[PDB]
Design a binder for this molecule. Structure first.
Ligand code: ASP
Ligand code: ASP
Ligand code: ASP
Ligand code: HG
Ligand code: HG
Ligand code: HG
Ligand code: NA
Ligand code: NA
Ligand code: NA
Ligand code: NA
Ligand code: NA
Ligand code: NA
Lengths: 411, 411, 411
């Protein structure tokens, strides 16, 4: 196979060629040839992604809840975690704002199979509240049911950490063995992400060739319209949040950005906040942060606290709905806020990861990826995921450095 | 929240206030206001309990079967385990006796939603026997099917212990890693039990306010009628079993009770045979039992061998049926005997645990907690669980000391 | 119970007595008495086997893929693994050949319940390809779906091994903890195999008494006709493959066989290539193989590389079909080739294991053991499994020694 090229370059080549191939075949009237021959490769790609969506959600949120659990956090831990959560929550809400004053997805509205998407009637508020508690965690796990899985995973993670405080040796031993296995399943799933992302240049080529062969050319305008809303959201997160909090804590944001420049560009290109952590930490040393602090806050923020991913997942969910034609209600919007923060946490810091955890948001909000309309819109975003994931990652790391500088400024 | 008060006092306050609130609102004709506003908090409480019911059953019975497995038991182990099982089996059968000459539950008979509970026809005896063997353990686990889960868990635990006898290092390593993870999941679930039991004072308040707003006042008489049957069963277990076997083995039961007085009262109040083990062992030393013996039999009996819990689960199952209106057939009664002994084993020694493992008996006998009638009767017992759990725990510990004294007298 | 006799002797006694009992009861017209009283014991036996089929498939193939993964194999590893795979692939294809020029199963054709087996129409090739990727590993695991489980298990195993290459300590730690738990579940399941195989003498007695009470006597001829096709396949694997490759690498096959004589007979009688490994290794030393080499290749081939099992599973699958009356299409036949190699890998080296992993092949090919016709033919082979398993095991070990000798000759 000798497929050696830098994945990001391969993905962008597949994306450009797919768009061209799709348009010339679609114009000349071969959208069916694309549908039958090209698309199944994109179909395989998305199947491999929604394959990992359930194990990742459970395992990553057990681990995520564990590394946040009150039983684990010192005074510096609580500080950095409160920052991480607030920044992420503000990021997704700002994504809502961007994805609302922009209307990405609108105009694409299609009914694959002639049947337009219809949201099923929401149960009473008491019901949907109680329903987040599963009656059989195994069952909720074994058949979708994302929200119960969220609930059980977060509970399990916290419970494990309190067991790790126990006086008894064997209790800690046992609790750590379970956590040490769940974590490691999560890590295994994200290796599979790396593997599937090696196939991504082909999948993306097919996904965009299909999406170009039909839906004409407006998709190019609408996909760029998403990218716009996301990136201006990212820059707003940098300016309106980082720059502001940095100035509030007596840190010149301009010199701060010049220091972070290396870690920010590394993240932007590598598209992995975990593979940028050595540069991120070297930067934090370069700007005079105390070893004891940033050697703990930065590796925690390498996986938790992805403000870009949260904002991305927020905007992307609005595109899915706007495409489908449904109007995301209030409540559904605050559902996004909560679940995208939780999805931002579960996301690994691997290139593809953010789009996989996006499904967790879609599923909770009521846009199931089994529905053909959802899956078509979901595929529509995977086409240009790498474009978003570059800026996405950069902001994920910038948030780490900012909070680390602020908390060190205090502690 | 600053909720600091002793849980048992909070539960009893919630129980008394709920009863009052329910009655005055029910009398004045506001049972619907209670149904719509108060009850959902009780509904949340029971949902959190039946959430844990499946993981606890699997994990605790893997661990329980492991600590009983013949591959693990020395000569002293076999002795104390044979005692533990016989005493537990006699306890539940005595519970049957008490719950039969008392008729608790009768007179409450209600059909929530109008339709009265109907037991589905039992398959042929060959079928129900074969059916305890699952064809897909994962499947049986993923959708109720308690009895298959019992079967697979018990088998898995025993198999692990034989792997732990193997000559090969890595075999033991792997087998211990799996057991060390299953145990630890069980421990995590029982932390969640502790957590949910912190909400219990509210849940119990709602459960009893609802049960008072409807069903008039007779519930008070019938709940007390259960408490009566349980406690006289507990005292009969002490007198007819412990006192008798103690005298058979040349141990004066009166001086025995005076020695155990501390451990017996500690259990009664703390409601945790595991949190009473330090007192239980200190007592066993006070009464001249050899270190090597009671340092092994007592911590084993701290989790296995809960004669009170078995008896409680036996009586409580009869209340559920008598309420529902069904007549527990012979066979169903010996099913109770077997499954309540197994449920007594799986129970942790945490306050709430016994009522959670009660569901395992109800489910096996054919009273599924999904059915509205079952769930209403099940909630009816949770209201006054702490009352039963006090004596329940005390007898669980008294059995430990009695057997430890008897086996030391021999070995 | 004091059931002490050598299992193989007990199984052969049960098999002979069952055949006699069945025939005299069937001739005298008591096939119904056998159906209602005898058969349920055989039914229990097969239920215990298809119980283990799902956990074993997942866990063994996670472990199997791990011990084959490129991230683990040195230059000697790659050599011995390439040998192991090619030999196993050739073995099953040779089984196909034997089970095709022999027609075992034909003439037995029955429709238990008056309804003859009908294969459900195959989806398009694109569909069945995509379908091997599950959308919820938990779901595929929780309800049959063998092929998705194959896919997820093999992926998970490989991913774990790459995590075990990571620079980070905790990553390797976590990945090894998960693997150390999955392995160990697999080991526990195979202890259950040992346990169930202690009941086998009764189960086999009932299975063959039922199969004799009905289906007259032709079954004896047809069962022997399978045994013939299998054993002549095994001898062909030895002569046409081992002897040939041994001569190609300058090793006199006759002196080789005389050296291996001990390990070959031990396997044949013990029916456990893992319990024969000490003899297998002692033989490899006796014939001048370098310590460093055979101490790694032989224990790997003790579990992976079962040429006899692959060949057995191939032939047996043809019997199941021929009985049922369906014609195994091309494609279905190469499916057998792939899945029987994979089943040969997952098989443990315990007596019973090969027939359990046969179900994995049957399930993938489209012969579900839930269907009554399949289950009847599947039971028809379990009757005489021990006969096949003796030669089966011997060839599994001979392949280990042959490859070890060949690779040592080179490396
Ligand atoms: N690529 C992002 C994570 C994601 O959204 O997939 C990061 O490394 O931070
Ligand atoms: N509380 C009991 C167990 C139970 O029945 O919940 C004990 O500690 O023994
Ligand atoms: N008994 C075989 C494995 C099997 O086919 O069950 C062996 O030991 O190699
Ligand atoms: Hg697209
Ligand atoms: Hg009540
Ligand atoms: Hg047979
Ligand atoms: Na994350
Ligand atoms: Na980050
Ligand atoms: Na106890
Ligand atoms: Na217990
Ligand atoms: Na072998
Ligand atoms: Na094998």
């Amino acid at each position: 196979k000798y497929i050696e090229y830098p994945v990001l370059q391969k993905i962008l080549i597949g994306l450009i060629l797919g768009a061209i191939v799709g348009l010339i075949l679609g114009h000349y009237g071969y959208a069916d040839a694309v549908k039958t021959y090209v698309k199944p490769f994109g179909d395989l790609f998305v199947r491999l992604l929604k394959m990992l969506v359930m194990p990742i959600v459970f395992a990553s949120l057990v681990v995520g809840a564990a590394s946040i659990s009150p039983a684990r956090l010192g005074r510096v831990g609580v500080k950095i975690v409160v920052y991480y959560l607030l920044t992420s929550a503000f990021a997704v809400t700002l994504g809502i704002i961007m994805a609302r004053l922009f209307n990405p997805g609108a105009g694409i509205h299609l009914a694959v199979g002639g049947q337009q998407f219809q949201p099923k009637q929401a149960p009473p508020l008491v019901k949907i509240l109680l329903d987040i508690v599963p009656t059989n965690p195994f069952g909720a796990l074994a058949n979708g049911q994302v929200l119960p899985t969220i609930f059980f995973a977060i509970i399990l993670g916290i419970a494990i950490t309190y067991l790790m405080n126990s006086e008894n040796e064997k209790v800690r031993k046992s609790a750590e063995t379970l956590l040490d296995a769940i974590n490691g399943l999560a890590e295994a799933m994200y290796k599979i992400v790396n593997g599937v992302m090696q196939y991504a240049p082909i999948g993306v080529f097919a996904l965009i060739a299909y999406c170009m062969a039909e839906q004409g050319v407006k998709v190019v305008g609408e996909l760029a319209k998403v990218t716009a809303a996301v990136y201006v959201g990212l820059t707003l997160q940098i300016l309106l949040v980082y720059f502001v909090l940095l100035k509030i804590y007596g840190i010149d944001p301009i010199s701060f950005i010049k220091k972070a420049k290396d870690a920010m560009l590394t993240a932007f290109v590598t598209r992995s906040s975990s593979g940028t952590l050595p540069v991120t930490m070297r930067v934090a040393k370069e700007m005079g942060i105390s070893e004891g602090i940033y050697s703990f806050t930065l590796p925690l923020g390498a996986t938790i606290n992805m403000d870009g991913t949260a904002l991305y997942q927020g905007v992307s969910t609005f595109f899915i709905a706007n495409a489908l034609g449904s109007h995301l209600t209030v409540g559904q919007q605050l559902t996004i806020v909560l679940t995208a923060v939780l999805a931002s946490i579960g996301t690994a810091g691997v290139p593809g990861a953010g789009a996989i955890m996006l499904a967790m948001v879609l599923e909770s909000v009521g846009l199931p990826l089994t529905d053909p309309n959802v899956a078509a819109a979901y595929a529509m975003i995977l086409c240009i995921d790498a474009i978003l994931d570059m800026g996405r990652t950069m902001v994920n790391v910038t948030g780490d450095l900012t909070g680390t500088a602020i908390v060190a400024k205090t502690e």
